[PDB]
Design an enzyme around this catalytic site. Structure first.
Site, PDB file in Angstrom:
ATOM      1  N   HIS B  41       0.800  -1.221   0.000  1.00  0.00           N
ATOM      2  CA  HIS B  41       0.000   0.000   0.000  1.00  0.00           C
ATOM      3  C   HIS B  41       0.836   1.275   0.000  1.00  0.00           C
ATOM      4  O   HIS B  41       0.256   2.353  -0.080  1.00  0.00           O
ATOM      5  CB  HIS B  41      -1.106  -0.011   1.075  1.00  0.00           C
ATOM      6  CG  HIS B  41      -0.619   0.205   2.479  1.00  0.00           C
ATOM      7  ND1 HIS B  41      -0.723  -0.765   3.454  1.00  0.00           N
ATOM      8  CD2 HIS B  41      -0.109   1.299   3.087  1.00  0.00           C
ATOM      9  CE1 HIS B  41      -0.260  -0.284   4.601  1.00  0.00           C
ATOM     10  NE2 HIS B  41       0.118   0.967   4.403  1.00  0.00           N
ATOM     11  N   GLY B 143       2.429   6.245   9.766  1.00  0.00           N
ATOM     12  CA  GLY B 143       3.830   6.138   9.426  1.00  0.00           C
ATOM     13  C   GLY B 143       4.517   4.896   9.956  1.00  0.00           C
ATOM     14  O   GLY B 143       5.648   4.617   9.548  1.00  0.00           O
ATOM     15  N   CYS B 145       3.605   1.796   9.415  1.00  0.00           N
ATOM     16  CA  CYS B 145       3.479   0.644   8.532  1.00  0.00           C
ATOM     17  C   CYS B 145       4.842   0.200   8.030  1.00  0.00           C
ATOM     18  O   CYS B 145       5.729   1.019   7.768  1.00  0.00           O
ATOM     19  CB  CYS B 145       2.540   0.959   7.373  1.00  0.00           C
ATOM     20  SG  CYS B 145       0.858   1.175   7.981  1.00  0.00           S
TER      21      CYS B 145
HETATM   22  C1  LIG Z   1       0.480   2.940   8.102  1.00  0.00           C
HETATM   23  O1  LIG Z   1       1.485   3.729   8.731  1.00  0.00           O
HETATM   24  C2  LIG Z   1      -0.868   3.053   8.820  1.00  0.00           C
HETATM   25  C3  LIG Z   1      -0.846   2.531  10.255  1.00  0.00           C
HETATM   26  C4  LIG Z   1      -2.188   2.818  10.925  1.00  0.00           C
HETATM   27  C5  LIG Z   1      -2.358   4.311  11.188  1.00  0.00           C
HETATM   28  C6  LIG Z   1      -2.899   4.419  12.611  1.00  0.00           C
HETATM   29  N1  LIG Z   1      -2.759   3.088  13.167  1.00  0.00           N
HETATM   30  C7  LIG Z   1      -2.295   2.207  12.288  1.00  0.00           C
HETATM   31  O2  LIG Z   1      -1.990   1.053  12.533  1.00  0.00           O
HETATM   32  N2  LIG Z   1      -1.883   2.340   8.065  1.00  0.00           N
HETATM   33  C8  LIG Z   1      -2.887   2.993   7.486  1.00  0.00           C
HETATM   34  O3  LIG Z   1      -3.037   4.202   7.578  1.00  0.00           O
HETATM   35  C9  LIG Z   1      -3.858   2.180   6.691  1.00  0.00           C
HETATM   36  C10 LIG Z   1      -3.735   2.561   5.226  1.00  0.00           C
HETATM   37  C11 LIG Z   1      -3.835   1.345   4.313  1.00  0.00           C
HETATM   38  C12 LIG Z   1      -4.001   1.854   2.885  1.00  0.00           C
HETATM   39  C13 LIG Z   1      -4.846   0.943   2.005  1.00  0.00           C
HETATM   40  C14 LIG Z   1      -4.563  -0.494   2.401  1.00  0.00           C
HETATM   41  C15 LIG Z   1      -5.081  -0.787   3.807  1.00  0.00           C
HETATM   42  C16 LIG Z   1      -4.993   0.437   4.711  1.00  0.00           C
HETATM   43  N3  LIG Z   1      -5.213   2.446   7.123  1.00  0.00           N
HETATM   44  C17 LIG Z   1      -5.619   2.121   8.339  1.00  0.00           C
HETATM   45  O4  LIG Z   1      -4.958   1.466   9.120  1.00  0.00           O
HETATM   46  C18 LIG Z   1      -6.969   2.610   8.731  1.00  0.00           C
HETATM   47  N4  LIG Z   1      -7.796   1.501   9.121  1.00  0.00           N
HETATM   48  C19 LIG Z   1      -8.499   0.836   8.227  1.00  0.00           C
HETATM   49  O5  LIG Z   1      -8.466   1.073   7.030  1.00  0.00           O
HETATM   50  O6  LIG Z   1      -9.332  -0.231   8.734  1.00  0.00           O
HETATM   51  C20 LIG Z   1     -10.498  -0.564   8.009  1.00  0.00           C
HETATM   52  C21 LIG Z   1     -11.736   0.127   8.532  1.00  0.00           C
HETATM   53  C22 LIG Z   1     -12.088   1.404   8.111  1.00  0.00           C
HETATM   54  C23 LIG Z   1     -13.245   1.999   8.600  1.00  0.00           C
HETATM   55  C24 LIG Z   1     -14.054   1.342   9.514  1.00  0.00           C
HETATM   56  C25 LIG Z   1     -13.698   0.068   9.920  1.00  0.00           C
HETATM   57  C26 LIG Z   1     -12.545  -0.538   9.439  1.00  0.00           C
HETATM   58  C27 LIG Z   1      -6.814   3.493   9.950  1.00  0.00           C
HETATM   59  C28 LIG Z   1      -8.175   3.631  10.619  1.00  0.00           C
HETATM   60  C29 LIG Z   1      -6.174   4.826   9.587  1.00  0.00           C
END
Ligand SMILES: *[C@H](O)[C@H](C[C@@H]1CCNC1=O)NC(=O)[C@H](CC1CCCCC1)NC(=O)[C@@H](NC(=O)OCc1ccccc1)C(C)C
Ligand SMILES: *[C@H](O)[C@H](C[C@@H]1CCNC1=O)NC(=O)[C@H](CC1CCCCC1)NC(=O)[C@@H](NC(=O)OCc1ccccc1)C(C)C
EC number: 3.4.19.12
Lengths: 306, 306
Positions: B41, B143, B145
């Site tokens: 991603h 950040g 990830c």
């Molecule tokens: C990478 O540094 C981050 C780490 C997260 C940010 C805060 N805590 C973390 O572990 N990862 C992301 O921002 C993810 C981006 C990815 C891009 C496309 C592929 C999969 C995601 N996004 C997330 O972790 C977000 N969570 C998420 O998408 O969970 C699914 C969801 C969404 C809405 C309602 C229920 C479930 C996060 C909420 C920012």
């Protein structure tokens, strides 16, 4: 999000760990520049430990009696001296892995990471608080003496603790890197009182702010309090009195959450008087006091080092 | 004595962390030999994340679109490929700090250390368990990830986890180092169910043994039970069923303490049915399930690495 008890990355300290042997005793030393630091009780036999005369015991020793291994790279000892409860062995080679470093004497209530070591080899890393009674609640077995506690500020390692002994309650005692014990303890195998411990109130409040930041927040109540009213409650529950300095240190977390410090104190007062009713906060069923404010800010701002 | 949640020393992993940037997105990568591994991603923009076609998105990218920094030492990308949910960037320089390593896919209930990283720089280290529902309860901000989970066996680093996302309950999900998610999750920003979690019964029992070893032991009762009787209790409290394999894994701790596994199960059954009555075990007011047996044995035998 999420909140975990997190230690500093340990690599800079790993490269400084050596093994020190004197006769029958092996423990860990810290190799910085051309000096190796270790507990002076490395010179004791099992019957010296009951009432050692360290001056008399050290006089029997010469440089060649101290064996220092770095891995299996091995160091020539060219001088030795005792500074308080630490022995300083001058070696003929400066540690090529010496990081930027300082020696600091930390205050009660502050935190640090411990790199637990055996035979000069790291075993694990965890975060500790120096309790108000100058003990730590660690995990230390035979051979762990000389393991060190430290903090990192970007590229600088601040060494603050070297492990010496375990008390009659499973708690741990040691010195700063100039060999001065934290607290009243002496390096003798004899019964020693730590005295009453208290809970680090400013750290509990910091952790309540961490909980709010992470959405955990059923405990926010309707009330407020005063610093004097709260301190009456703190006294009954063996909590450290809260001062304006503590309120000011909590300012950034207060500003981030919009919860006034005295409002958070009122929530804490109700948790103290009523318990948690079988609920949890940040996964704990107890009020946690081993996160400083400043630990909380770094964990929820993502501060890095190298 | 003493018992702490302890992470592995992180130095071997620190030397493998790099920063990967693609366009607007920066995250962490793992640099081993001449390959850098990171979440795929990294190629997504903020509107790709809602429903990304990773094949189509990657086709738009060439080697020169992936910026990899090791510190400020910087790497030339000479190939790229996608393996499941990880991107593999071939670089022209083998990491001179590559440790002996393996990629492993861990089982639910096992533990590992996480080196949380931002912009390719380590921030902290803590121990996690892979929950029975294939989530972890970590501490991860924007950040983080590409931060990795690992275990060490003397000199060999077994990488088992790379962080990808946070779910709608504050829990965390990611992949093994071949890019296969643990659990049912996909790398899309959409609502995703983890399903019911359960408590890791063999780990709770291991921790009760750790408590006895450390003299904490008011909970030892008069009763015994059977594996089938205990499992009826485990069911009602959402505990994993105990098998003979689990009993056998607990053998060393059973032999060390002289407490039969089914006797410890009877103590656990009474703790489940009656609670802890405001007492603590190893400093916790909850039953802890994030120590494996084998973690307990190493912590109370002093196993080292380097
Ligand atoms: C990478 O540094 C981050 C780490 C997260 C940010 C805060 N805590 C973390 O572990 N990862 C992301 O921002 C993810 C981006 C990815 C891009 C496309 C592929 C999969 C995601 N996004 C997330 O972790 C977000 N969570 C998420 O998408 O969970 C699914 C969801 C969404 C809405 C309602 C229920 C479930 C996060 C909420 C920012
Ligand atoms: C060095 O590797 C060990 C680390 C301890 C072993 C287990 N947990 C530890 O933290 N340190 C020692 O073995 C100490 C030897 C020193 C030699 C002479 C200078 C001071 C001690 N000894 C201890 O930690 C012992 N504890 C102790 O002496 O506390 C005083 C005491 C004794 C009896 C009753 C009350 C208080 C420990 C019990 C082995």
């Amino acid at each position: 999000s999420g909140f975990r008890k997190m230690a500093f990355p340990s690599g800079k300290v790993e490269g400084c760990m050596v093994q020190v042997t004197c006769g029958t005793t092996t423990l860990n030393g810290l190799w910085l520049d051309d000096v190796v630091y270790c507990p002076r009780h490395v010179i004791c036999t099992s019957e010296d430990m009951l009432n050692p005369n360290y001056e008399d015991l050290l006089i029997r020793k010469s440089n060649h009696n101290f064996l220092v291994q770095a891995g299996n790279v091995q160091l020539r000892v060219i001088g030795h001296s005792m500074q308080n409860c630490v022995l300083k062995l001058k070696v003929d080679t400066a540690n090529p892995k010496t990081p930027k470093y300082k020696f600091v004497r930390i205050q009660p209530g502050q935190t640090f990471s411990v790199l637990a070591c055996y035979n000069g080899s790291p075993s694990g890393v965890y975060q500790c608080a120096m309790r108000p009674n100058f003990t730590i609640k660690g995990s230390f077995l035979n051979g762990s003496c000389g393991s060190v506690g430290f903090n990192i500020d970007y590229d600088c390692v601040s060494f603050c603790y070297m492990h010496h002994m375990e008390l009659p309650t499973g708690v741990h005692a040691g010195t700063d890197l100039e060999g001065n014990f934290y607290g009243p303890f002496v390096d003798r195998q004899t019964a020693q009182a730590a005295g009453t411990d208290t809970t680090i109130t400013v750290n509990v409040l910091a952790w309540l702010y961490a909980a709010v930041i992470n959405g955990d927040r059923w405990f926010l109540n309707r009330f407020t309090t005063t610093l004097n009213d709260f301190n009456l409650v703190a006294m009954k529950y063996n909590y450290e009195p809260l001062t304006q300095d503590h309120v000011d240190i909590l300012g950034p977390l207060s500003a981030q959450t919009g919860i006034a410090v005295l409002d958070m104190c009122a929530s804490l007062k109700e948790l103290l008087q009523n318990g948690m009713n079988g609920r949890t906060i940040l996964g704990s069923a107890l009020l946690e006091d081993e996160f400083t404010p400043f630990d909380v800010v770094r964990q929820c701002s993502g501060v890095t080092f190298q």
